[PDB]
Scaffold this active site. Structure first.
Site, PDB file in Angstrom:
ATOM      1  N   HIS A  68      41.798 -13.923  51.672  1.00  0.00           N
ATOM      2  CA  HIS A  68      40.974 -14.225  50.673  1.00  0.00           C
ATOM      3  C   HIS A  68      40.060 -15.302  50.804  1.00  0.00           C
ATOM      4  O   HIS A  68      39.931 -16.450  50.301  1.00  0.00           O
ATOM      5  CB  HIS A  68      41.663 -14.711  49.073  1.00  0.00           C
ATOM      6  CG  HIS A  68      42.129 -13.219  48.402  1.00  0.00           C
ATOM      7  ND1 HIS A  68      43.321 -12.707  48.596  1.00  0.00           N
ATOM      8  CD2 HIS A  68      41.103 -12.261  47.688  1.00  0.00           C
ATOM      9  CE1 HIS A  68      43.293 -11.546  48.057  1.00  0.00           C
ATOM     10  NE2 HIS A  68      41.931 -11.297  47.250  1.00  0.00           N
ATOM     11  N   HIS A  72      36.041 -12.677  54.158  1.00  0.00           N
ATOM     12  CA  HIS A  72      35.970 -11.719  52.865  1.00  0.00           C
ATOM     13  C   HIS A  72      34.771 -11.626  52.081  1.00  0.00           C
ATOM     14  O   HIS A  72      34.256 -10.898  51.663  1.00  0.00           O
ATOM     15  CB  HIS A  72      37.291 -11.797  52.063  1.00  0.00           C
ATOM     16  CG  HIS A  72      37.422 -10.847  50.743  1.00  0.00           C
ATOM     17  ND1 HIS A  72      37.633  -9.574  50.771  1.00  0.00           N
ATOM     18  CD2 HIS A  72      37.282 -11.235  49.805  1.00  0.00           C
ATOM     19  CE1 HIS A  72      37.650  -9.145  49.414  1.00  0.00           C
ATOM     20  NE2 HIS A  72      37.614 -10.154  48.894  1.00  0.00           N
ATOM     21  N   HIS A 106      32.509 -14.618  44.958  1.00  0.00           N
ATOM     22  CA  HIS A 106      33.350 -13.813  43.858  1.00  0.00           C
ATOM     23  C   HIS A 106      34.948 -14.348  44.104  1.00  0.00           C
ATOM     24  O   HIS A 106      35.632 -14.197  43.172  1.00  0.00           O
ATOM     25  CB  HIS A 106      33.604 -12.379  44.020  1.00  0.00           C
ATOM     26  CG  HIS A 106      34.050 -11.792  45.198  1.00  0.00           C
ATOM     27  ND1 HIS A 106      34.061 -12.034  46.417  1.00  0.00           N
ATOM     28  CD2 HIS A 106      35.370 -10.777  44.809  1.00  0.00           C
ATOM     29  CE1 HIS A 106      35.098 -11.277  47.055  1.00  0.00           C
ATOM     30  NE2 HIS A 106      35.916 -10.715  45.992  1.00  0.00           N
ATOM     31  N   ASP A 107      35.136 -15.001  45.247  1.00  0.00           N
ATOM     32  CA  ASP A 107      36.755 -15.356  45.390  1.00  0.00           C
ATOM     33  C   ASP A 107      36.775 -16.751  45.596  1.00  0.00           C
ATOM     34  O   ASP A 107      37.586 -17.150  46.086  1.00  0.00           O
ATOM     35  CB  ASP A 107      37.267 -14.559  46.600  1.00  0.00           C
ATOM     36  CG  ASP A 107      38.094 -13.344  46.011  1.00  0.00           C
ATOM     37  OD1 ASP A 107      38.541 -13.278  44.975  1.00  0.00           O
ATOM     38  OD2 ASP A 107      38.145 -12.244  46.716  1.00  0.00           O
ATOM     39  N   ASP A 217      34.585  -5.010  46.645  1.00  0.00           N
ATOM     40  CA  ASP A 217      35.868  -5.781  46.923  1.00  0.00           C
ATOM     41  C   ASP A 217      36.945  -5.210  47.913  1.00  0.00           C
ATOM     42  O   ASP A 217      37.601  -5.755  48.417  1.00  0.00           O
ATOM     43  CB  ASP A 217      36.315  -6.320  45.268  1.00  0.00           C
ATOM     44  CG  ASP A 217      37.269  -7.420  45.396  1.00  0.00           C
ATOM     45  OD1 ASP A 217      37.481  -8.311  46.652  1.00  0.00           O
ATOM     46  OD2 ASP A 217      37.841  -7.804  44.389  1.00  0.00           O
ATOM     47  N   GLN A 269      50.801   1.911  50.866  1.00  0.00           N
ATOM     48  CA  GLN A 269      49.253   2.177  51.185  1.00  0.00           C
ATOM     49  C   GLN A 269      48.905   3.525  50.472  1.00  0.00           C
ATOM     50  O   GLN A 269      47.827   3.506  49.984  1.00  0.00           O
ATOM     51  CB  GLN A 269      49.004   1.865  52.598  1.00  0.00           C
ATOM     52  CG  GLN A 269      48.997   0.648  53.188  1.00  0.00           C
ATOM     53  CD  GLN A 269      47.951  -0.348  52.361  1.00  0.00           C
ATOM     54  OE1 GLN A 269      46.851   0.040  52.137  1.00  0.00           O
ATOM     55  NE2 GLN A 269      48.643  -1.252  51.384  1.00  0.00           N
TER      56      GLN A 269
HETATM   57  O1  J8J Z   1      48.402  -0.260  43.975  1.00  0.00           O
HETATM   58  C1  J8J Z   1      48.601  -1.321  44.367  1.00  0.00           C
HETATM   59  N1  J8J Z   1      48.058  -2.465  43.844  1.00  0.00           N
HETATM   60  C2  J8J Z   1      47.163  -2.565  42.616  1.00  0.00           C
HETATM   61  C3  J8J Z   1      47.964  -1.836  41.246  1.00  0.00           C
HETATM   62  O2  J8J Z   1      47.419  -2.811  40.488  1.00  0.00           O
HETATM   63  C4  J8J Z   1      47.188  -3.609  41.852  1.00  0.00           C
HETATM   64  C5  J8J Z   1      49.349  -1.626  45.754  1.00  0.00           C
HETATM   65  C6  J8J Z   1      50.772  -1.297  45.662  1.00  0.00           C
HETATM   66  C7  J8J Z   1      51.508  -1.387  46.722  1.00  0.00           C
HETATM   67  N2  J8J Z   1      52.906  -1.110  46.954  1.00  0.00           N
HETATM   68  C8  J8J Z   1      52.946  -1.442  48.492  1.00  0.00           C
HETATM   69  C9  J8J Z   1      54.583  -1.420  48.974  1.00  0.00           C
HETATM   70  C10 J8J Z   1      55.463  -0.651  48.275  1.00  0.00           C
HETATM   71  C11 J8J Z   1      56.908  -0.588  48.946  1.00  0.00           C
HETATM   72  C12 J8J Z   1      56.922  -1.092  50.017  1.00  0.00           C
HETATM   73  C13 J8J Z   1      55.904  -2.033  50.555  1.00  0.00           C
HETATM   74  C14 J8J Z   1      54.740  -2.119  50.098  1.00  0.00           C
HETATM   75  N3  J8J Z   1      52.074  -1.996  48.861  1.00  0.00           N
HETATM   76  C15 J8J Z   1      50.956  -1.846  48.154  1.00  0.00           C
HETATM   77  C16 J8J Z   1      49.511  -2.248  48.199  1.00  0.00           C
HETATM   78  C17 J8J Z   1      48.793  -2.238  46.980  1.00  0.00           C
HETATM   79  N4  J8J Z   1      47.492  -2.628  47.071  1.00  0.00           N
HETATM   80  C18 J8J Z   1      46.755  -3.092  48.183  1.00  0.00           C
HETATM   81  O3  J8J Z   1      46.899  -2.807  49.345  1.00  0.00           O
HETATM   82  C19 J8J Z   1      45.638  -3.772  47.800  1.00  0.00           C
HETATM   83  C20 J8J Z   1      44.565  -3.848  48.691  1.00  0.00           C
HETATM   84  C21 J8J Z   1      43.451  -4.520  48.488  1.00  0.00           C
HETATM   85  C22 J8J Z   1      42.171  -4.504  49.617  1.00  0.00           C
HETATM   86  C23 J8J Z   1      42.121  -4.151  51.035  1.00  0.00           C
HETATM   87  C24 J8J Z   1      41.431  -3.582  50.031  1.00  0.00           C
HETATM   88  C25 J8J Z   1      43.339  -5.253  47.315  1.00  0.00           C
HETATM   89  N5  J8J Z   1      44.307  -5.175  46.525  1.00  0.00           N
HETATM   90  C26 J8J Z   1      45.483  -4.380  46.634  1.00  0.00           C
HETATM   91  O4  J8J Z   1      46.177  -4.526  45.707  1.00  0.00           O
HETATM   92 MG    MG Z   2      39.573 -11.954  43.965  1.00  0.00          MG
HETATM   93 ZN    ZN Z   3      37.784 -10.346  46.606  1.00  0.00          ZN
END
Ligand code: J8J
Ligand code: MG
Ligand code: ZN
EC number: 3.1.4.17
Length: 313
Positions: A68, A72, A106-107, A217, A269
């Site tokens: 962040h 970014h 934004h961050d 974002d 992912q």
């Molecule tokens: O669904 C997810 N999170 C949202 C729901 O409400 C917030 C989510 C769930 C996840 N479970 C795991 C995971 C599960 C078991 C073992 C290991 C890992 N890994 C994840 C990454 C996630 N999310 C992002 O990678 C993510 C990426 C980015 C930027 C690249 C674009 C921004 N924000 C993010 O949250």
């Molecule tokens: Mg933010």
């Molecule tokens: Zn951001």
């Protein structure tokens, strides 16, 4: 005045595409941002002395966190640049100005922890802002810098236009609170498929700009696979650190943040792409068709993550 910024040919050309990567050279990012402003908006939108000063003060107020950070900040702004350039008759003069600035800010002053973690930590920002904690801090920091002597890039605007462009920016920044995104894309889905979506409705524009902001974002899932895969290292470095701090508070972290579950990242992912990224760029393509490349790139990367699971890399 008649002083424009130029880029090397390859950058000049690739920067117009959605999947552009701004590169490992920190010192060119400010030129890159100014270039996008001049092309998105005009050579006249901001005073070059003030803009450069605003740009550098913003940069300084991003922290050296894994994800962040200042890279970014400019990446998200470039995605906005490309959405605007592929849709340029749809947005007011004021919206072009305030949206690219909104993305750059934004961050601001992000520490690499979620709103959830501030709240469980009992951080003072969690007492000052009960919802969208970090995002209200970001907009406050933005106004902070705007009021530094010599920094008000909006000084030429009338009183009324000034109040509008700050209101654009503020809603735009709050929108990057992913906790609000699901509700916003759902209302946008209904409106679009019942035909009630009216871009002359200001509250509808707000929703659309919001979605744009979520799309910008998360744009790291819409880069070419080698960029996406290495960006993921940076995100989990923050996630696992925050999980380490959750353990220090005596709380088990969600698996997303537990670094003992590295092995289950590809599957994590996958669900993210399915629950967030794909619906986001789908609905965005339905409203703004020229943004289809983001959905195509997102889908491609979804496909790469399935390959990672199957042991094909
Ligand atoms: O669904 C997810 N999170 C949202 C729901 O409400 C917030 C989510 C769930 C996840 N479970 C795991 C995971 C599960 C078991 C073992 C290991 C890992 N890994 C994840 C990454 C996630 N999310 C992002 O990678 C993510 C990426 C980015 C930027 C690249 C674009 C921004 N924000 C993010 O949250
Ligand atoms: Mg933010
Ligand atoms: Zn951001």
């Amino acid at each position: 005045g008649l002083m424009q910024f130029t880029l090397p040919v390859r950058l000049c050309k690739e920067i117009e595409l959605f999947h552009f990567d701004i590169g490992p050279f920190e010192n060119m990012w400010p030129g890159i941002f100014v270039y996008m402003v001049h092309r998105s908006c005009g050579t006249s939108c901001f005073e070059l002395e003030k803009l450069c000063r605003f740009i550098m003060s913003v940069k300084k107020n991003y922290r050296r966190v894994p994800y962040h950070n200042w890279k970014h900040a400019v990446t998200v702004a470039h995605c906005m640049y490309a959405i605007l350039q592929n849709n340029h008759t749809l947005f007011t003069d004021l919206e072009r100005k305030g949206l690219l600035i909104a993305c750059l800010c934004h961050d601001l002053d992000h520490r690499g922890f979620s709103n959830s973690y501030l709240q469980k930590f009992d951080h003072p920002l969690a007492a000052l802002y009960s919802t969208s904690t970090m995002e209200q801090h970001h907009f406050s920091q933005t106004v902070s810098i705007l009021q530094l002597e010599g920094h008000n890039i909006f000084s030429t605007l009338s009183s009324s236009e000034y109040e509008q462009v700050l209101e654009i920016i503020r809603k735009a920044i709050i929108a990057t609170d992913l906790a609000l995104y699901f509700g916003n894309r759902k209302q946008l889905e209904e409106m679009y498929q019942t035909g009630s979506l009216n871009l002359n409705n200001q509250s509808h524009r707000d929703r659309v700009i919001g979605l744009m902001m979520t799309a910008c974002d998360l744009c790291s899932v819409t880069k070419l696979w080698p960029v996406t895969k290495l960006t993921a290292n940076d995100i989990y470095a923050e996630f696992w650190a925050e999980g380490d701090e959750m353990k220090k508070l005596g709380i088990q972290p969600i698996p997303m943040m537990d670094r003992d579950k590295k092995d289950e990242v590809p599957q994590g992912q996958l669900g993210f792409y399915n629950a967030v990224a794909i619906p986001c760029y789908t609905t965005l393509t339905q409203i703004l068709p020229p943004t289809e490349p983001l959905l195509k790139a997102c889908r491609d990367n979804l496909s790469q993550w399935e390959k990672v699971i199957r042991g094909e890399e």
